[PDB]
Design an enzyme around this catalytic site. Structure first.
Site, PDB file in Angstrom:
ATOM      1  N   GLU A  32      -3.855  -0.518   2.470  1.00  0.00           N
ATOM      2  CA  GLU A  32      -3.368   0.227   3.891  1.00  0.00           C
ATOM      3  C   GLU A  32      -4.762   0.282   4.490  1.00  0.00           C
ATOM      4  O   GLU A  32      -5.695   0.503   3.782  1.00  0.00           O
ATOM      5  CB  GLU A  32      -2.601   1.419   3.383  1.00  0.00           C
ATOM      6  CG  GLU A  32      -1.109   0.914   2.605  1.00  0.00           C
ATOM      7  CD  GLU A  32      -0.462   1.974   2.278  1.00  0.00           C
ATOM      8  OE1 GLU A  32      -0.646   3.195   2.578  1.00  0.00           O
ATOM      9  OE2 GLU A  32       0.650   1.778   1.355  1.00  0.00           O
ATOM     10  N   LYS A  37      -4.818   3.386  -1.107  1.00  0.00           N
ATOM     11  CA  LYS A  37      -3.645   2.916  -1.776  1.00  0.00           C
ATOM     12  C   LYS A  37      -3.184   4.043  -2.862  1.00  0.00           C
ATOM     13  O   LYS A  37      -3.874   4.369  -3.552  1.00  0.00           O
ATOM     14  CB  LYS A  37      -3.711   1.537  -2.384  1.00  0.00           C
ATOM     15  CG  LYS A  37      -2.302   0.969  -2.736  1.00  0.00           C
ATOM     16  CD  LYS A  37      -1.313   0.727  -1.924  1.00  0.00           C
ATOM     17  CE  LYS A  37       0.155   0.643  -2.566  1.00  0.00           C
ATOM     18  NZ  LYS A  37       0.642   1.715  -2.716  1.00  0.00           N
ATOM     19  N   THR A  38      -1.953   4.490  -2.775  1.00  0.00           N
ATOM     20  CA  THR A  38      -1.253   5.248  -3.821  1.00  0.00           C
ATOM     21  C   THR A  38      -0.794   4.615  -4.871  1.00  0.00           C
ATOM     22  O   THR A  38      -0.446   3.282  -4.742  1.00  0.00           O
ATOM     23  CB  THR A  38      -0.324   6.254  -3.237  1.00  0.00           C
ATOM     24  OG1 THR A  38       0.620   5.523  -2.711  1.00  0.00           O
ATOM     25  CG2 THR A  38      -1.010   7.378  -2.103  1.00  0.00           C
ATOM     26  N   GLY A  39      -0.488   5.158  -6.160  1.00  0.00           N
ATOM     27  CA  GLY A  39      -0.006   4.468  -7.150  1.00  0.00           C
ATOM     28  C   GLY A  39       0.648   5.554  -8.116  1.00  0.00           C
ATOM     29  O   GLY A  39       0.372   6.649  -8.236  1.00  0.00           O
ATOM     30  N   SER A  40       1.979   4.903  -8.677  1.00  0.00           N
ATOM     31  CA  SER A  40       2.598   5.864  -9.463  1.00  0.00           C
ATOM     32  C   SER A  40       3.532   5.258 -10.759  1.00  0.00           C
ATOM     33  O   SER A  40       3.963   3.973 -10.451  1.00  0.00           O
ATOM     34  CB  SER A  40       3.554   6.881  -8.950  1.00  0.00           C
ATOM     35  OG  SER A  40       2.845   8.044  -8.190  1.00  0.00           O
ATOM     36  N   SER A  91       1.494   1.650  -8.666  1.00  0.00           N
ATOM     37  CA  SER A  91       1.330   0.487  -7.225  1.00  0.00           C
ATOM     38  C   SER A  91      -0.003  -0.008  -7.005  1.00  0.00           C
ATOM     39  O   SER A  91      -0.182  -0.920  -6.352  1.00  0.00           O
ATOM     40  CB  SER A  91       2.102   1.041  -6.088  1.00  0.00           C
ATOM     41  OG  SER A  91       3.529   0.894  -6.499  1.00  0.00           O
ATOM     42  N   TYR A 109       8.661  -1.346   2.193  1.00  0.00           N
ATOM     43  CA  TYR A 109       7.892  -1.430   0.819  1.00  0.00           C
ATOM     44  C   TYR A 109       8.865  -1.839  -0.391  1.00  0.00           C
ATOM     45  O   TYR A 109       9.763  -0.989  -0.506  1.00  0.00           O
ATOM     46  CB  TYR A 109       7.296  -0.043   0.814  1.00  0.00           C
ATOM     47  CG  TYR A 109       6.359  -0.040  -0.552  1.00  0.00           C
ATOM     48  CD1 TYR A 109       5.153  -0.667  -0.594  1.00  0.00           C
ATOM     49  CD2 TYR A 109       6.358   0.955  -1.460  1.00  0.00           C
ATOM     50  CE1 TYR A 109       4.240  -0.581  -1.617  1.00  0.00           C
ATOM     51  CE2 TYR A 109       5.539   1.247  -2.501  1.00  0.00           C
ATOM     52  CZ  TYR A 109       4.392   0.303  -2.507  1.00  0.00           C
ATOM     53  OH  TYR A 109       3.377   0.735  -3.306  1.00  0.00           O
ATOM     54  N   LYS A 118      -1.058  -3.459  -7.107  1.00  0.00           N
ATOM     55  CA  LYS A 118      -0.938  -3.998  -6.202  1.00  0.00           C
ATOM     56  C   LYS A 118      -1.944  -4.777  -5.613  1.00  0.00           C
ATOM     57  O   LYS A 118      -2.076  -5.786  -4.889  1.00  0.00           O
ATOM     58  CB  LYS A 118      -0.040  -3.953  -5.007  1.00  0.00           C
ATOM     59  CG  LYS A 118       1.494  -3.289  -5.349  1.00  0.00           C
ATOM     60  CD  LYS A 118       2.391  -2.679  -4.582  1.00  0.00           C
ATOM     61  CE  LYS A 118       3.811  -2.651  -4.736  1.00  0.00           C
ATOM     62  NZ  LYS A 118       4.141  -1.920  -6.143  1.00  0.00           N
TER      63      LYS A 118
HETATM   64  B1  P1K Z   1       4.196   2.287  -6.532  1.00  0.00           B
HETATM   65  O1  P1K Z   1       3.610   3.059  -7.573  1.00  0.00           O
HETATM   66  C1  P1K Z   1       5.812   1.467  -7.042  1.00  0.00           C
HETATM   67  N1  P1K Z   1       6.603   2.530  -7.406  1.00  0.00           N
HETATM   68  C2  P1K Z   1       6.365   4.042  -7.594  1.00  0.00           C
HETATM   69  C3  P1K Z   1       7.745   4.423  -7.553  1.00  0.00           C
HETATM   70  C4  P1K Z   1       8.226   5.653  -7.981  1.00  0.00           C
HETATM   71  N2  P1K Z   1       8.909   5.543  -9.249  1.00  0.00           N
HETATM   72  S1  P1K Z   1       7.974   6.196 -10.270  1.00  0.00           S
HETATM   73  O2  P1K Z   1       8.798   7.331 -10.843  1.00  0.00           O
HETATM   74  O3  P1K Z   1       6.899   6.638  -9.882  1.00  0.00           O
HETATM   75  C5  P1K Z   1       8.054   5.127 -11.765  1.00  0.00           C
HETATM   76  C6  P1K Z   1       8.297   3.604 -11.736  1.00  0.00           C
HETATM   77  F1  P1K Z   1       7.498   2.953 -10.670  1.00  0.00           F
HETATM   78  F2  P1K Z   1       9.504   3.388 -11.163  1.00  0.00           F
HETATM   79  F3  P1K Z   1       8.188   3.082 -12.792  1.00  0.00           F
HETATM   80  N3  P1K Z   1       8.740   3.087  -7.681  1.00  0.00           N
HETATM   81  N4  P1K Z   1       7.756   2.023  -7.578  1.00  0.00           N
HETATM   82  O4  P1K Z   1       4.452   2.812  -5.147  1.00  0.00           O
HETATM   83  P1  P1K Z   1       3.743   4.030  -4.458  1.00  0.00           P
HETATM   84  O5  P1K Z   1       2.823   4.757  -5.549  1.00  0.00           O
HETATM   85  O6  P1K Z   1       4.645   4.597  -3.580  1.00  0.00           O
HETATM   86  O7  P1K Z   1       2.796   3.344  -3.516  1.00  0.00           O
END
Ligand code: P1K
Length: 355
Positions: free
Chosen positions: A269, A309-312, A61, A147, A64
């Site tokens: 954020e 900002k976090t990302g996953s 994320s 979100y 973004k």
């Molecule tokens: B973003 O990283 C978008 N985001 C996170 C998730 C959580 N699902 S996942 O297991 O991390 C893998 C996926 F993204 F689905 F491929 N879903 N969408 O958001 P954050 O980090 O919460 O701001």
């Protein structure tokens, strides 16, 4: 004092590898234009390959932020207005209920009917177009933040049409070069595949992100620790970058609305600085991330701001934070997810200890 940065990062980040069985981690700190890189463990378990300055991680994320910057660049080159509706650019969404939503509302998640994800069934360019046409309002547009990857993803696609290039070329050919990034990609090319970390799931299986609808603008960027430190530098100290990109960065820093103590800017954020630990943690709470929340106009315009900002992805954790007036920021990249609260806390202790 400088000889404390490594120590602090060791004290606060290093234990998380054992606690969560994370194979590899890169932590960067920038302070007063000086960069510090801390590498730990392996980018590939099977290959016994160490994390280093060449290691490419999935930002999830955090991508973004690049989408938002790309929006800011396009607005300041006159290519879009945040008041426009997607229908002006995606000629096909005209006169549909989505085309009452403006570009800002999408970027900042306030369409009133968009979820964290698209339905699994949606995959093709064709299913994407259908999802949007069929879309109907639920909450009063602009009133509620939920979100959403589709929300900013559509914003992303619109920013691309406005620049007459597919989203990927917007970042790789325009945005990344302007930011001086040398190893940031939407599509990791063949000559870099050996530098691309395996991510690792909660079963410690090696995995990388799967192709998905409007994935690039929502969570599809990959980068190195040096590049991410350069990105934070640009955020902290923009006046040095081309005027084009200074404007784009400024735009991402402006708060649009609040939800109690969290201000929504473009991608970032925003918080009043200093922030309490729990303020930072709350931005990532179930209530905020997972549920609709009614927004309010900004009332207190914070004098001194900090941004995060976090990302996953399924196998990667990311966190970025910066405080302009302390001239400091931090980047954490892991090839296994760890709780968002762990990322935020470790960053909090380090940045507080230095400044
Ligand atoms: B973003 O990283 C978008 N985001 C996170 C998730 C959580 N699902 S996942 O297991 O991390 C893998 C996926 F993204 F689905 F491929 N879903 N969408 O958001 P954050 O980090 O919460 O701001």
């Amino acid at each position: 004092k400088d000889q404390e940065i490594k120590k602090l990062v060791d004290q606060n980040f290093k234990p998380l590898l054992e606690k969560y069985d994370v194979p590899g981690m890169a932590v960067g700190v920038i302070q007063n234009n000086k960069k510090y890189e801390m590498y730990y463990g392996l980018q590939s378990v099977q290959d016994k390959k160490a994390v280093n300055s060449n290691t490419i991680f999935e930002l999830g994320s955090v991508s973004k932020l690049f989408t938002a910057t790309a929006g800011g660049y396009a607005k300041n080159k006159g290519k879009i207005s945040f008041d426009d509706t997607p229908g002006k650019y995606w000629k096909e969404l005209k006169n549909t209920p989505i085309d009452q939503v403006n570009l800002l509302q999408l970027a900042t998640y306030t369409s009133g009917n968009l979820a964290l994800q698209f339905p699994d069934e949606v995959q093709t360019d064709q299913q994407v177009l259908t999802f949007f046409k069929d879309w109907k309002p639920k909450n009063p547009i602009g009133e509620y933040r939920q979100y959403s990857n589709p929300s900013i993803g559509l914003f992303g696609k619109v920013v691309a049409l406005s620049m007459n290039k597919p989203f990927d070329q917007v970042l790789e050919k325009t945005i990344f070069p302007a930011l001086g990034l040398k190893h940031s990609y939407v599509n990791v090319p063949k000559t870099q595949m050996q530098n691309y970390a395996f991510g690792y799931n909660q079963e410690n299986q090696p995995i990388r992100v799967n192709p998905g609808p409007l994935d690039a603008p929502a969570y599809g960027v990959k980068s190195t620790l040096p590049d991410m430190l350069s990105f934070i530098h640009a955020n902290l100290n923009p006046q040095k970058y081309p005027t084009d990109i200074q404007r784009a960065i400024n735009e991402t820093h402006q708060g649009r609305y609040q939800v109690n103590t969290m201000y929504q800017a473009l991608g970032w954020e925003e918080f009043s600085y200093p922030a309490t630990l729990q303020t930072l943690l709350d931005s990532n709470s179930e209530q905020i991330v997972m549920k609709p929340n009614k927004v309010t106009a900004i009332s207190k315009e914070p004098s001194v701001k900090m941004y995060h900002k976090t990302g996953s992805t399924s196998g990667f954790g990311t966190y970025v934070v910066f405080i302009p007036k302390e001239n400091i920021g931090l980047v954490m990249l892991t090839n296994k997810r760890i709780p968002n609260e762990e990322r935020i806390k470790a960053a909090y202790v380090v940045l507080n200890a230095i400044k």
